[PDB]
Each structure stands twice: as C-alpha cells, then as structure tokens.
Write a protein that binds this DNA or RNA. Structure first.
Ligand code: 1RY
Ligand code: MG
Ligand code: MG
Lengths: 358, 983, 363
DNA sequence: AAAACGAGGGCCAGTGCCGTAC
DNA sequence: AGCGATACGGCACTGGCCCTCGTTTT
C-alpha cells in the first residue's frame, strides 16, 4: 500500500521502481536493503541470538560454508550444523541434549529465464533423545511464539499451526497475518536420525550420545526462522493524516534524533556534537540532523523522523546555551516536552531498559 | 685591506691609536704561540649607502634612539611615580565591563579606562579557564575594576573569542601598563592579539627587581633555607621573586596576606561569586603593593641601568607575538594521539612482563629469582568479625529430562541471590586494594575507587626503579640494585676483602644463579672489575666505579645497548626498542601540559587585515589567531627572557614526538617571518674582551684570532675547527668550548669529552692535557709560581704581593676576572650593574663562575637589546610593515610580510653590523673585522624553525601538510636598499 | 607452530588434521569452532564500533552475494558502489561519506579448481579529489592503529606504501606470522573510474557538494580480511627464553576474547542452594558478558587441570562459588593475566567485570 | 553498655634525576 | 684561592600530618 513508498524515501529498502512489489519482496529477488532495514535486521538478529543465549544450558554458535564442499549453493541451514555435530560433542562432554544456532544468508531459486533469490535466516538445530523430543518441540514452539509476541504490536497477528506427515512425525509452523494473506515466518520440524544417519554411516558408534548412563542416537529438532519476512512483519505491524512507524524501542534502528533551532552558529554545533558523543558513549543510536544544513520546517521534520521510527526527537535551541534546557518530543504520544540536557542520557537509558519485559 | 681586516666605514675618520710596542708584543706573542701562516682569503667587500647617522658617534645615535623610543613611556611612568593615591572603594561594583571609582569610590559604568598609564593584575578562574574573570587597576587619577561576562549563569562554550579585557583606546603617547609578571596580564588583553599594533607597551616589576637586586637559583635555594664564611651578608639585601617577598624588600611594609584557600586555582566559579567582594579586595591589595614596589624600583633601576638602550630593549622584549591557525589544534590532537599510542604499547609490554612474573609466588620459588627477591611478596586475607553463633562447624556445612513448568524458578534464584547480597555488605568496611596479589603488584596497580581506573597493573615506568630490575640483564652480569645510586655507569694494585655469614633473620640472598647467568652470558670482587663486568656477593660497596652520582635509570645509553653490553632478557631487541620508545616521548612527557594548556585567542574575519582576505587564502573556512608568548622581560642572569614553554621548546628532530612545536608558529597569508641567529656572540665577545684589553686591534690574542677567522659557509669556524680534531660536530664542541671558558674542570672535561667521542680514557686524557694549555698557567706553603723570579727564599717578608692572580698564555680569563674583582658596578659595555647580592662588596663573594658568566652573558643580552632598538629604529622610519618581535636570546625573528621580507633582512644585516661596531667602539677602536660584521644566516619563510629545510616526526610529511619552503641568506639580499623603491 | 592442538582441544577451530597454513590462508577451511566464531564475532563488532558508529557520515550497506545476470562476488566494494546515489540522497550530497559492510566473499582458487570463502570487512569512502591522499593517509593510520591495539606485541603489524600500475597510491597492511609477513587489509585510492563507468548517461546525479562547489567523488577503499585477522590475534596471543617455568596460555585482549568469565562450583559437593549459581549466570548474561557454566562436570580433578583448560580458552577470570560464600558472600576469583586467588563480593564482581571490559576498551 | 589507642590511606611538601633550550 | 652558566619543567620517591576504623575497655 502506502507503506512501501515511505520505505523508499526513508531508505528501509534499496532503490527500485518495478521490483518494489509485495511479491518481489516476498521473493529473495532484490534490490537488497537500505541502511534502516540493515540496522533493523541487525537489532532483530541481536535480539534473536539473545533470546537463545539466555537458554539453559548451552547452545554453541557456528558458521557453515555457502557453496558445495565438493564443487551448489545452500538451500537449508541444517547440513552445516550437522557437520559440526561430532566435533561439538566434545565440548559439551557428550553430557546432555544440546543445540547449535546460526544466522546466515541462505538462497532459493526464483522463477523469460529464471533467477536466484536471497533470504537471511536464523536456524537452530536441537539434538535431543527421542523420548523427550516432542515435548521439547512444543517447548520451542511456545518460546518462539512468545519471542515473536514480545516485540509485536499485536499478538493476534502472529499465529501457530500444527501439522505432520510420514517423514516428520510432528511439526509446527509459525505464520504471520498481514492481512493481505497470512505468510510463513518460521518452521519447527522434528526430523528423525535418518538425516544424521545418512551422512555418517558408519560406524554410527560416534553418533549416540549419553543420556543418563544410556547410549542413544538423538532425534533432531529443526528450527528455521526468516528475519527478512520478520522485518517486513514488524514493519507492517508498526504502520499507523498521520504516517508514523511505531517499531519497538529495543528493535527500532535509530531511536533518537537531534537538530538545532537557532540560526547556523558554531556553538550550537558544539553542543550537539557533545550530546552526540555522550549518547553514543552509552550505546544509543542517534541521527545527526544538526549538520544540517537548513533545518526547514519542524512539521515535515517530525514527519520524516516519524516515518523513520525515531523514538524521541531533540531540539537544541539558543536557550539551551543558557539554562541547558532542551526540547524533547515523543513518537508514541507526540508530546512536546522540555528537559535538562544532563538528564537526557539517563532518561533514554531508563526508557529502553523499561521496555525489557515479557 | 687593511690591517688584516676592515671594511669601508663612515664611523669615524680617526682612528689609530697605533700602539707600536703593543702590536710588537702581540705579533711576538702570536709568533711564539704561534700563528703566522695566514690563509690570506679576503671576503667580498660591500659598498652601500648607509642610513642617516645622527652623530657624533654611534653611542649617541643608539642613545638618542633608545631615549626617543622610551620617552612617552618614561613620562607615563613618571605620572605613576608622582601619583597621589585615591583610597580604595567601600564596596566593589558587581557589573560587567569597567567601573570607574573616583570621588568617594562611586560606581561609574565605563567601557574603557582612558589613562596614560596604570598598574594591572588580572584574575582568572583556573577551574574553567583560561578566560579572565576579575581585574583591578589603579591610575594616577582614580581606581578601576573590571568584571567579565561570568556574572550570568550560563552553559557557555569557550573557543577563546575576543572576550579578554579591553584596554587600548581607539584613534578614529599613548599607553603604558606596569604590573607584577606583566606578560600574563598582557596575554589577557583584547587588542594585543591583533596582527597590527601596538602603541601600548608593558613594564614588568619582577624583571625590574631581577635587574636591580636579583639572585641566582643557587642563591634562591638557600635564601628560603633561612627558616661560606661571609656568604650570609647578602641575605637581607635581596629576595626571591615572589610578590610578598619583593614588597617586603622594596617597601618593607607589613606582610601582605595571600589567599588561604587559593580559590582561583583550588575552587570553582561557584565559590568565587560567594566571596566576590573579598577576592576583589585581594586583587586590590596586589595592585597596590605592585604600585608601591614599582614606585620604589623605577628610580633604582634608572640608576643601576643608566643606558636607555636597556630600557627600550626591555620595552620591546615584552611585546612578543606568535601567529597561529587550526593547524595548532591539529598538532595538539595528533601529537597527543601519538603519545598515548606509544605509551599504550610500552605500558602494555611492561605490564605483560609484570603479569607473567607474578606467577612465581607459589611456592616460594621467588627466592631463586636473581631480580625478584628484595620486594614484598605479601599474602593478605583480611578481615572479618564474629556475629553469628554458636558451637557448630560452618566449613563443611546424572539424571536426564526436560522441565519448564517452573517458569518462575528463575526469579526465585534471583531473589535468593539479591537477598544473599545485601546481608554481607555490613561485614567489611572500606574496600582495600587487592590483598591476594603481592605487595609490589598492589603498588603497581591503581586504586579500585579511583575515577581513572585502568585494568590490570598500570602506572608502569620507565622511568621507575622496580621495572628496570624486573627484566634487564646488567652489564655482562645479572643483578642490578639501588641504595645511594643504581647500577654504576656513566655520570699500583687495589684490593678489597670479602665475607659470608648467617645470623637470622633477614631476606634470603641467592648468588648462584648469578654465577650461572654469567656462565650463560659468556657461552657465546676480583678480578674483572676494571673494564669487564661482574657482581660480587653481598657487602655492598663501589669496588670499581667511575660516576660519582649514579643513574636511575639507564635512559640514554642506546650506544651501550645496541652494542651488546648491556642488553635485556626476555628478550632480544625489546630492550633497544623500549629505550627508543622512551627517547621518543621524553620531550612530550615533560611538556604536554604546557603545550596543550598553552592558550590562544582566535580573531574573527571582522577584526583582521582585509589585505590578508584579499590574498588568495581564507583558507577554506579556516580560523586564524595568535598567542602572546607570555615572557618575563628580564630574569637572572643576565636580565634574559624567561618563559616556561617556548624557551625550552624542543627543536626539529625526526625522533621526538612534539618536535614540531617550534615550527607550528605559522605566519598569516601575505605575511612571512624574517629572522637571524648570531653566529656566534659569546665567543667573539670573550675574544674582544681579550684583545681590547691586550691591545688596540682585534686580533692581538691567541684566542681572539681563531674566533674571527673561520666561516661557517663551506668552511670551518672555531667550533668547527675544534670539532674536527676529532672531535665531534658540532653542538658538542660548542658545549666543550663554552664549558671551558667558564671553568674547564679536568674531570668534567674528561667525562664530557669521553661521553661525546666514545673511546678509551688514556688517549682522551692525553687530548685533554693537550687542550688544557689554553688556561695555563696561573698564579709558607703555596703554588710554586709567584711575582718573584723564584719561590725558594729564607724568611722573606712579602705578604704585600699575594694579591695578584691571573692565568697566562693563550686565553684572556684575566679580564673576565678583572670585571669579577671590582667592588664597583662592573658593567661593560654597556653597561648595567646587577644584584646587590653578587656584588663582592659585603659578599665573600665566592661566586666567581656565576660572575664571569654574568659578564659575557650580559654582553649577550645588551647585544640583544641593541639589536632590538636598532631593528625598531629603521622599521618605523621606513615603510616596513610588521614590527612584531619574537626572540630567543641569540636568535631573533620578526613577523614581516611577503613583499617587504628582503628589505627586512637587509635591516637585520644593518642591525647586526651596527651592533658589532658598537661593541667594537665601546673598547676601541671603531674599526672591526670582516668575517663577523654581517649575518651569515637569515631565515625567511612562513613558519619559524632552525634550518631552511625542515622534516618532522608526527606529521611525517612537512610540506605534505600545508607548508612552503625556506630560503638561506645570504649575499643576494645585499642588492635591495633600505629605500622603498627596489627591484 | 604447535598451538594447533590447543585449537582443536578447545574449539576455536575445526578438529580436522587437514588445516595447513594454505588451507587457512585461502579460506578453504572446514569452519571455525564456537569459540572461534565468537572470537571473530567480537573482532568484527570491534571493527563495527571503531569504524561505523563513532564516525558520522558512515552508514551500513547491504550488498547482495551474486549478480541477477556460476561464480559469485569477489569483493563487496562493487555492491556498495551500486548504492551510491541513494546513500547520497540520505546524506544530502555532503561528502566525504562512507559505506561499510562486513560480508563473506568467495575467491576462486586453483589448488596446485576449488573455491575458498573468507569473511571480509570493507569500507568504501567517497571523498573529494582535493582531499583524497589525506583521507588515504588518515585511514591508513587509523586502521593500522585499530589493528596494533589488542596486541601483546604491536611490533608485528606493519604497513607498506605501494603504487598502482597506473599511478594510483595505495597501502597494504601486514601481520608478521612465524613464517613471514602476510596481507590482512588493503587500502586503495580509486580515481573515480568505476563510478563513471557505472553511470555513463547523467554524470549530474554523481556530483557531491565538496563545500562551495559540487565535484566528482574520488573513491577510497579499505578491505580487511577478518579471518586472517582472527588467526593473527590467535597467534599473537600465544607465547621466550630463560623463563625457567612455562605455562600454556593464550593472552587474547579482554575485549575480543570469546569467553569472558567462567563460573564453577566448589566444595563440593554442596546441595542444594546452588541455584544461586543460576542467578549469577543470568545476571551476568543480562549484562552481556560471556560466562562459561561449570555445573555438570566429570571432573572431579585437580584445579590446575581446569585452570589450564580455561587459560587455553583465554578466559579472563575464573569465579568460584563455594559454601563459605553461601555463608557470608565473598566468592573466589582467579585472573588469567596474573594467576592469583582473590576474594570479592557478588554485585561487586558483576560491576568489576563490566568496568574491566569498559576500561580495557580505553587506554 | 562507653572512653581510648593504634593501623591504614590520602594530601601535603621536599628531594633526587632527568628532559629541553640558549 | 675552585668551579659550567643562565633558566624552564616533569615524574619517582618519602616521611609526616590527618582522618577513619577496628582492636581493645566502664
Ligand atoms: N652552554 C652554553 N652557554 C651559554 O651561555 N650559551 C649562550 C648564551 S647566549 C649565547 C647564545 O649561544 P648559542 O647557543 O646561540 O651558540 P653560539 O651562537 O655562541 O655559537 P653558534 O653560532 O651557535 O655556533 O651563548 C650557549 C651555550 F650553548
Ligand atoms: Mg649562534
Ligand atoms: Mg642561540
């Protein structure tokens, strides 16, 4: 709709005129991403790795090759995780059921002639005994659904579906309502040892791991989520005469922006540079609109910063050079407030840490 | 042509003054000495139209010049002396700008205090400087008090604007400002920073005190000890340079009180305003005391320094000026970055060595370490007290699944944790340093509650005394030590006993690993104590040392580090590289404060010469500014310049970090600096003081002939002639010579020449004994040389002859001693007496060397003054724009412009010539040699430096950064006459 | 050339015996271990910090791995060059400005027929022709500076000034491996040739405001192999004469180190208020510091064993939880740099770790 | 329960060696 | 009478005054 157009003028996506359709975006075919989309994706992936690093006991990060080891590119992100299985058996001391997570750029063919598309996906391969396989599969279902629910503006948009077949005993798929058509966001399968037993026969005496004085070849859980589709999901979840993207604070790429109000004076630039440094010193993404060069209107400025999903906008006028007072302006409430420049860092940090809840 | 050297002069027709017996004695002296192999190489004689002389001699020329240059200022000072003081106001006005206090101390809002002259002392809150905050100034009419904009509470942004105090009056005579350390006040003047100007000059009471009744640093050290038989008679006639002391000296009034809180340097701006009235009052006391002191000093200085040359010379010497730009800030940033990097590397390596050496604590294996056993090796674990009870021991009191139903067991463990936390806090008290680590490691760590805490062991050094022993092997030996001096180094049989006993309890001393390390070293108390290297057992004593001081630590022994002995391990070339790192940051370590804090005021595009804006340089949103060097006009000895930063400013070495500091003074576009270095002054001065005492001509001495014989251009000076003996070129030979003239001590010349040439002691000693000929000879029981023809006699009464003393042969030290015996002023020529504390009247005086040095260095400083007044005289008389001066004792550089640079250099040559002729005339004759009459080098370029071709370290590429090139001079500048119409 | 066993034993690398210097330098290695990819993660993040975040006018770019028209990309410079106009629109034509990206690249290699992939962090700096060599010198000094820190011996990393076949100036960054120097990062000054070739029609949309005039941007480029860098730091971390006593430990810089602290259980056995260890665990990971869990264990062995096991993993500190700490509240601590026992409080330990990393990042 | 004495660390100035210039 | 001289600073080290806290006291 009118969301794809404000992602072009605000650089969430790369420049296109024909391959800007919903179908081409759902496709791996690109026109990749604009800086905003890149940062959104990076924060999203950071939170993903965070939502799986807090998980007890231990999951080891790995990286797989992209091409065929014997001469070709990868479709799934499972094989590479399976190759490092026997090795990472040593590090866990073969003690308990354990997993391997990884985030990578996987490919898939897109259909004149036919081309190839890219999607950046995050996968987790969870090795667990057959008896406690299904239960852990449901566990991961819950934790993943909750994961998509945390940053969501609406939990009803995210859905979870059950299924099965002859190859997979029980599987679950995570869908996302658009609502121009509910789409696939993540797949959770319960593959047997066949996949693993196919690339190590044999003497298969290496594969079975200890399970309380018990030797047993572990059932394999295949977690596979898409972060591009997820990015688009949250983008459509944030779209709200007003045209403002209300992405989640922890997820939002740039979370604050500051300009000047008084005419182009070196001192204003000095103060703004100071605040720039102070804010970047405590890990806060800030957009420098004080460069500037003109600082035209304030309304189209706020419109620009709202279409960029900036949490707070800051204005450094000439009065700031006296009292230290500065013009704050929210996004979710758009309330024009004012406060001292020294207590800005603390307020922002506290606001970000307050959004930490599940 | 003629008389072995003279030029075409119009400085007096007569003249000889032949002295035939005298020149016969001189020629006879120079034949037996003996030098009679003349090279006969006539320098190209110069014919030019000299500027108007005012007659009769050049003495009265310079006198009239110096008087007319200092007449308005003298009048102003006289207006300060006969001034009737209006009393201090009852209360100070708390208003921005100036406030005039006239009748009954009322408040008259004024922008500029229009007075012919006034005393001054500015105040500055150091807490957020270097911006002026308070000021008080009294005038022959009334009082004035200036306040800065720091009256309103704001969040300012200091980029050093034109906020400094305004003092100069506008045109569309005239000014004089006196004060204690007047240059610091001058640096806070709004209109002193402008490229042009200025009519206003300054008078320093401190410099004046130094000129009148000053004292040496050595005299200062024992003056303050007042809290060598007749060395205490000058204790009450002079004083240290403090304001309270100099007031208690010249006024002798009640002891003025000093601020007990030091609020301007200890406190903030907040606690200043709370005590505004009082601080103002303090400033008033200061300017009042300064006024009294000045009033008492001016006539004294005028008496002791009668020649106006010194007056005007001291006037222009105070108004120095250093133009700069953004490249300064770039210089600061880059140099500081380089410094922090090298220090990061060094400290990283050292703390790495310190970390891996901390592992041999367990168990007691440190006693075997030949380097690490003197120190602590402590093991603490304190402390706790009992509060729980009673009578029970608190020291001893594989299943697979997948559960998650206990979703809130996490916050349970969390609650358990936090509840467990806030119940131990009352068990200890004050967090001490890490006890688990040995003491030597605790000391080598920053405190935990320190705002600048860095991880692991910081504070590593270089130049400490723990770390050099921590690693370094020691001169073909193993251990190094310290007690009264560190490892012995640089700056008929003898035997010494040994011993070894035990008694308990001291620290264990190993001495086997030493022997084995010696074995490992030679794998590739006696003997081996002379030239080789070894360490005994215990004792401890010298047993084969040459230095009488020691050296902690070896930080300038690179050739004795990159030749084998000595080295370090582990290991390899880490030693020489560490020493390199030290040498690189040696300058910036002891200067970074003075350089980075060195303020500078930027002037906007409104208050600058538009004739520069027209020049094809803006430059690209570039800022242009400047800084006044802030120099004490006269400091001992003799009345030279004294400045914390720019006088101790390192030269251009490709090794040092902040070595570009000298070349950062970049002249504004359209402008260029033209300067010169006297080569040489002190040597030729000593020479003249020799030949003018011996005879009438200039070459009638053994020493005074070799001086004015060599040319530095494609030739060999006297310094260069002693440097090629060999010999070491060239600064070293200079140090050897100037060291010889002021006390050529046999062991000093020994260890020095041996330090500079790097050979063996015997041949060196031979060379020294060969060169000690110059000072030889000299004079019941006594030295076997007197006025009688033989010393041996029987009961011969002659106590009336033991009053004469003087060396013989080559040198002329006898005259330098002659000026050092007179109990009366001793002022040649001109011509100013100094210090009631060094005058042999009522002083032992036992300060001979300081007085000889005073003689010749004063000749150098009077030389400086003469150069100044001369340069100023033909800079205003003619159309030479840019009169701003920048001098360093010998060298002197003027800030001119690109179109008047050659005529300015010409003015320099003129100046030098006239000054040389002055020194010649003050002793006779007016005739002067050739290869000494004119400057050999005259630098003309954008930034100031040593040579015309400059390289650097930190910016790596000099011309890579926006620079130009220099030009040597020369003989080609002798084609542009002082008249405006040239080329 | 024997620390390989330490790379296999503790997975910073693959456990395959076929890991020759060629196989690693080419990018044909089977893959890095978890500790290895975490090490490379922190190294790359430390690139991202001291290149993109701190310096303005620098924005992240997402270049694809292939071409819409088989072989892949050999460098991620081009894909960045493609995004020039839009990233000119977001900066309002205010050059100099740069685009950085850390992407894996594929190099064709003829083994004396295969293809080796290696992760590279490239930054393309669009700068006016008036200030090309100055920015080249700047980035040379700052890249070299960024690589010379973290090092236990910065003397190894060197730089080489070299010129193009045409005349374009460029600089190469070397690390001194035990078998000689090796290229790890390449800096070049491309004279706006490629951009001109990419936009033949309208050269107007390429003009960037130098200040008072719009000029054609000269293209600077710095490509840093983070794999070879990771290996370089891995070698630098490991220790060398008359030391009298040797211990196996790799001293990685505390910032890029894979596992920060290691939490264990001592004395031993003690049940069952050991749930506090879980508390310290989640508290630690909440503040983003890597903590190894020493709970389920088969050893039950000498402390020197797991101490050496943690020093082979370059773990900074070893925190020990015993029952006496369950009593009062002073856990044990053993630093890697200096092996020494030290008692400390809990929240004091958390904040000590945070301050340790934060201050290590500084001077 | 309550008064007193000794151990620990910071702020202070003095002192010894070294860094530069001219 | 015997002699390096004029300065400007820095950092490393130290013995002593002073405040705080604990070990020891009605
Ligand atoms: N050791 C020294 N003592 C000094 O008193 N001086 C100075 C005080 S002023 C005058 C200037 O000496 P310079 O350093 O410029 O050396 P110079 O001009 O006498 O000799 P040269 O021309 O520089 O070769 O003699 C120099 C020394 F090197
Ligand atoms: Mg000279
Ligand atoms: Mg000189």
């Amino acid at each position: 709709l009118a969301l794809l157009e404000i992602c072009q003028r605000r650089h969430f996506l790369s420049g296109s005129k024909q391959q800007l359709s919903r179908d081409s975006l759902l496709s791996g075919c690109h026109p990749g991403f604009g800086p905003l989309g890149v940062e959104l994706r990076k924060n999203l992936a950071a939170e993903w790795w965070t939502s799986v690093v807090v998980f007890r006991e231990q999951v080891f990060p790995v990286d797989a090759l992209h091409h065929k080891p014997g001469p070709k590119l990868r479709e799934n992100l499972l094989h590479g995780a399976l190759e490092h299985y026997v090795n990472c058996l040593d590090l866990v001391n073969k003690r308990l059921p354990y997993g391997l997570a990884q985030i990578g750029v996987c490919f898939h063919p897109v259909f004149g002639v036919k081309s190839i598309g890219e999607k950046t996906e995050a996968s987790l391969v969870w090795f667990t005994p057959p008896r406690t396989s299904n239960q852990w599969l449901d566990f991961w279902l819950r934790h993943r659904l909750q994961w998509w629910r945390k940053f969501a503006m609406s939990p009803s948009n995210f859905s979870s579906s059950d299924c099965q077949d002859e190859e997979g005993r029980k599987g679950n798929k995570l869908y996302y309502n658009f609502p121009w058509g509910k789409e696939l966001i993540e797949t959770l399968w319960n593959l047997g040892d066949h996949e693993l037993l196919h690339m190590y026969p044999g003497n298969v005496s290496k594969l079975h791991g200890r399970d309380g004085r018990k030797n047993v070849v572990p059932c394999v859980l295949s977690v596979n989520g898409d972060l591009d589709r997820g990015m688009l999901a949250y983008l459509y979840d944030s779209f709200q005469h007003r045209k403002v993207l209300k992405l989640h604070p922890c997820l939002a790429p740039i979370k604050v922006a500051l300009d000047v109000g008084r005419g182009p004076t070196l001192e204003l630039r000095q103060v703004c540079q100071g605040l720039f440094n102070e804010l970047l010193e405590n890990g806060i993404s800030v957009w420098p609109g004080y460069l500037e060069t003109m600082q035209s209107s304030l309304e189209q400025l706020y419109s620009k910063y709202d279409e960029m999903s900036i949490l707070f906008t800051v204005l450094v006028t000439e009065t700031t050079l006296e009292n230290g007072l500065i013009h704050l302006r929210s996004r979710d409430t758009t309330m024009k407030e004012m406060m001292h420049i020294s207590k800005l860092k603390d307020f922002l940090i506290k606001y970000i840490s307050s959004a930490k809840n599940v | 042509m003629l008389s072995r050297g003279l030029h075409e002069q119009i400085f007096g027709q007569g003249g000889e003054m032949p002295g035939e017996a005298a020149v016969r004695r001189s020629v006879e002296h120079l034949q037996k000495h003996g030098l009679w192999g003349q090279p006969a190489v006539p320098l190209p004689d110069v014919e030019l139209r000299l500027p108007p002389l005012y007659g009769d001699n050049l003495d009265q020329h310079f006198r009239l010049l110096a008087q007319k240059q200092s007449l308005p200022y003298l009048e102003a000072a006289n207006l300060l002396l006969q001034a009737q003081l209006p009393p201090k106001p009852p209360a100070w006005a708390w208003a921005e700008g100036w406030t005039r206090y006239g009748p009954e101390g009322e408040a008259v809002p004024v922008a500029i205090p229009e007075e012919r002259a006034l005393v001054f002392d500015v105040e500055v809150c150091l807490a957020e400087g270097t911006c002026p905050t308070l000021a008080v100034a009294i005038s022959p009419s009334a009082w004035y008090s200036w306040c800065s904009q720091r009256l309103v509470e704001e969040r300012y942004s200091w980029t050093s604007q034109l906020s400094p105090a305004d003092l100069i009056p506008l045109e569309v005579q005239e000014q004089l400002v006196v004060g204690h350390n007047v240059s610091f006040d001058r640096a806070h003047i709004r209109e002193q920073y402008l490229i042009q100007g200025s009519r206003m000059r300054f008078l320093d009471t401190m410099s004046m005190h130094m000129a009148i009744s000053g004292l040496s640093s050595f005299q200062r050290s024992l003056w303050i000890a007042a809290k060598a038989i007749s060395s205490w008679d000058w204790l009450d006639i002079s004083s240290v340079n403090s304001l309270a002391e100099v007031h208690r000296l010249y006024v002798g009034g009640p002891p003025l009180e000093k601020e007990p809180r030091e609020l301007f340097v200890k406190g903030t701006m907040k606690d200043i305003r709370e005590n505004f009235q009082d601080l103002m009052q303090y400033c008033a006391q200061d300017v009042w005391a300064t006024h009294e002191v000045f009033q008492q000093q001016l006539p004294l200085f005028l008496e002791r320094c009668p020649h106006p040359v010194t007056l005007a010379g001291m006037l222009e010497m105070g108004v120095s000026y250093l133009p700069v730009n953004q490249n300064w800030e770039r210089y600061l940033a880059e140099a500081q970055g380089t410094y922090e990097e090298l220090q990061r590397e060094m400290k990283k390596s050292l703390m790495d060595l310190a970390n891996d050496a901390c592992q041999l604590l367990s168990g007691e294996r440190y006693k075997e370490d030949p380097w690490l056993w003197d120190l602590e090796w402590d093991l603490q674990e304190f402390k706790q007290k009992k509060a729980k009870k009673v009578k029970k021991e608190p020291a001893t009191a594989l299943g697979p699944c997948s559960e998650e139903e206990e979703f809130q067991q996490d916050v349970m463990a969390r609650a358990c944790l936090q509840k467990l936390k806030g119940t131990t806090e009352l068990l200890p008290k004050r967090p001490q340093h890490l006890p688990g680590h040995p003491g030597w490691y605790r000391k080598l760590c920053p405190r935990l509650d320190d705002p600048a805490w860095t991880p692991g062991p910081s504070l590593l050094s270089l130049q400490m005394r723990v770390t050099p022993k921590l690693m370094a092997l020691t001169w073909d030996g193993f251990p190094l030590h310290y007690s009264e001096r560190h490892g012995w180094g640089y700056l008929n049989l003898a035997k010494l006993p040994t011993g070894t006993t035990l008694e308990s309890a001291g620290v264990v001393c190993p001495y086997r690993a030493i022997e084995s390390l010696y074995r490992k070293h030679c794998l590739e108390p006696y003997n081996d104590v002379d030239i080789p290297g070894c360490w005994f057992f215990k004792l401890p004593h010298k047993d084969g040392n040459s230095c009488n001081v020691g050296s902690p630590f070896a930080k300038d022994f690179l050739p004795k580090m990159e030749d084998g002995t000595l080295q370090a391990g582990p290991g390899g070339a880490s030693g020489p590289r560490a020493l390199e790192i030290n040498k690189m940051i040696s300058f910036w370590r002891n200067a970074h404060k003075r350089i980075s804090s060195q303020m500078v005021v930027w002037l906007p595009r409104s208050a600058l010469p538009r004739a520069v804006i027209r020049h094809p340089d803006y430059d690209e949103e570039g800022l242009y500014g400047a800084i006044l060097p802030q120099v004490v006009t006269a400091g001992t000895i003799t009345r030279r310049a004294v400045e914390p930063t720019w006088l101790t400013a390192s030269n251009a070495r490709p090794d040092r970090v902040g070595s570009e500091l000298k070349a950062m003074v970049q002249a504004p576009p359209g402008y260029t600096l033209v300067g010169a270095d006297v080569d040489s002054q002190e040597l030729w001065i000593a020479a003249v003081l020799g030949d003018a005492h011996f005879a009438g001509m200039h070459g009638c001495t053994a020493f005074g002939w070799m001086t004015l014989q060599g040319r530095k251009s494609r030739g060999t000076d006297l310094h260069s002639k002693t440097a090629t003996t060999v010999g070491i070129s060239r600064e070293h030979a200079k140090i050897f010579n100037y060291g010889r003239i002021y006390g050529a001590g046999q062991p000093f010349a020994e260890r020095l020449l041996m330090q500079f040439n790097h050979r063996l002691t015997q041949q060196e000693a031979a060379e020294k004994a060969q060169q000690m000929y110059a000072a030889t000879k000299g004079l019941l029981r006594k030295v076997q040389r007197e006025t009688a023809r033989k010393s041996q006699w029987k009961k011969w009464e002659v106590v009336a002859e033991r009053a004469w003393k003087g060396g013989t042969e080559s040198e002329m030290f006898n005259k330098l001693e002659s000026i050092a015996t007179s109990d009366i002023p001793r002022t040649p020529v001109l011509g100013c007496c100094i210090s009631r504390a060094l005058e042999p009247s009522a002083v032992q005086e036992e300060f001979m060397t300081s007085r000889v040095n005073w003689v010749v260095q004063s000749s150098a400083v009077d030389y400086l003054h003469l150069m100044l007044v001369a340069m100023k005289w033909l800079f205003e008389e003619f159309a030479i724009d840019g009169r701003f001066c920048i001098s360093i004792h010998d060298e002197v550089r003027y800030l001119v412009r690109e179109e008047d640079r050659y005529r300015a250099a010409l003015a320099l040559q003129i100046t030098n010539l006239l000054t040389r002729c002055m020194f010649a005339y003050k002793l006779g004759l007016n005739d002067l040699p050739q290869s000494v009459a004119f400057f050999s080098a005259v630098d003309i370029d954008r930034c100031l430096r040593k040579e015309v071709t400059m390289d650097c370290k930190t910016p790596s590429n000099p011309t890579g950064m926006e620079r130009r090139y220099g030009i040597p001079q020369g003989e080609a500048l002798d084609i542009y006459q002082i008249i405006e119409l040239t080329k």
